[PDB]
Design an enzyme around this catalytic site. Sequence first.
Site, PDB file in Angstrom:
ATOM      1  N   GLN A  19       0.803  -1.225   0.000  1.00  0.00           N
ATOM      2  CA  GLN A  19       0.000   0.000   0.000  1.00  0.00           C
ATOM      3  C   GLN A  19       0.836   1.274   0.000  1.00  0.00           C
ATOM      4  O   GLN A  19       0.345   2.345  -0.400  1.00  0.00           O
ATOM      5  CB  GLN A  19      -0.935   0.024   1.222  1.00  0.00           C
ATOM      6  CG  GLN A  19      -0.197   0.153   2.547  1.00  0.00           C
ATOM      7  CD  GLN A  19      -1.133   0.297   3.745  1.00  0.00           C
ATOM      8  OE1 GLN A  19      -1.754  -0.669   4.187  1.00  0.00           O
ATOM      9  NE2 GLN A  19      -1.222   1.498   4.274  1.00  0.00           N
ATOM     10  N   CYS A  25      -5.025   1.100   4.046  1.00  0.00           N
ATOM     11  CA  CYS A  25      -5.189  -0.255   4.571  1.00  0.00           C
ATOM     12  C   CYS A  25      -6.625  -0.743   4.532  1.00  0.00           C
ATOM     13  O   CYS A  25      -6.860  -1.912   4.281  1.00  0.00           O
ATOM     14  CB  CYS A  25      -4.680  -0.339   6.004  1.00  0.00           C
ATOM     15  SG  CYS A  25      -5.582   0.717   7.165  1.00  0.00           S
ATOM     16  N   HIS A 159      -4.904   0.078  12.086  1.00  0.00           N
ATOM     17  CA  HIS A 159      -4.464  -0.557  10.861  1.00  0.00           C
ATOM     18  C   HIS A 159      -5.359  -1.763  10.559  1.00  0.00           C
ATOM     19  O   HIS A 159      -5.531  -2.641  11.401  1.00  0.00           O
ATOM     20  CB  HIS A 159      -2.988  -0.950  10.981  1.00  0.00           C
ATOM     21  CG  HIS A 159      -2.404  -1.552   9.739  1.00  0.00           C
ATOM     22  ND1 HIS A 159      -2.573  -1.000   8.485  1.00  0.00           N
ATOM     23  CD2 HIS A 159      -1.619  -2.641   9.563  1.00  0.00           C
ATOM     24  CE1 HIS A 159      -1.941  -1.738   7.592  1.00  0.00           C
ATOM     25  NE2 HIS A 159      -1.354  -2.737   8.220  1.00  0.00           N
ATOM     26  N   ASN A 175      -0.466  -8.870   5.760  1.00  0.00           N
ATOM     27  CA  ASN A 175      -0.282  -7.428   5.844  1.00  0.00           C
ATOM     28  C   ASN A 175      -0.147  -6.856   4.432  1.00  0.00           C
ATOM     29  O   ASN A 175      -0.054  -7.599   3.453  1.00  0.00           O
ATOM     30  CB  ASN A 175       0.924  -7.068   6.743  1.00  0.00           C
ATOM     31  CG  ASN A 175       0.825  -5.667   7.352  1.00  0.00           C
ATOM     32  OD1 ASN A 175      -0.078  -4.899   7.050  1.00  0.00           O
ATOM     33  ND2 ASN A 175       1.773  -5.335   8.204  1.00  0.00           N
TER      34      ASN A 175
END
Length: 212
Positions: A19, A25, A159, A175
């Site tokens: 990202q 996110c 997040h 992630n």
Amino acid sequence: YPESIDWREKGAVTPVKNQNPCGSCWAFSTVATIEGINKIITGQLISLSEQELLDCERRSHGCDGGYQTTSLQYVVDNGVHTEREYPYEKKQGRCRAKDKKGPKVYITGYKYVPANDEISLIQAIANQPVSVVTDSRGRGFQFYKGGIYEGPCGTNTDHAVTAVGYGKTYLLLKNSWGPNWGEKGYIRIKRASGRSKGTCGVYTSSFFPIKG
Ligand SMILES: *[C@@H](C(=O)O)[C@H](O)C(=O)N[C@@H](CC(C)C)C(=O)NCCCCNC(N)=[NH2+]
């Protein structure tokens, strides 16, 4: 539920994405859940477009952050294009969803996981990848190298990530900081037992898409 599951191994997870430096996110978390449920239902694993959500889902605040509900609702209402047709530009731009005529992926709704409860989350991941949140502010998390992460980390979540599996003592997390972070893009986070905000607040706020 099975003792463990890895949706990567079940073929429901696309390569790790990056990202950065855009704080989007929320979009990555949602898209990964869509990629996952699409495979489970249709047999197809296709990388879908975070950029579309970024450009087009403007209840969320672009690279300044967003919401699981609004981004999941976007895909219910509008579906989403492939990443190939609508690639990441690392910043919000004009919503070009209508200009793109390629293949799309729709969902029919989404469900909220009851919060702060181990087994409610585990049961959800057994069925499909789940959008989850974590407190990522700390050095321990940001510079995580590998293993089952037990701490240190707060529970002030900031997040949005994707739960793609679990084991006896951990939750497998995809992630969105690229494959050079953690375990080739992934973190294994300790399962806190029962009623709990979870390790790094991982039980705080969880949603999954429905494709019916
Ligand atoms: C996270 C990131 O990209 O690192 C990104 O800031 C984000 O979307 N975070 C979410 C986390 C929640 C626990 C879902 C978030 O903070 N969303 C709320 C709105 C974003 C912050 N508010 C403003 N004013 N931009």
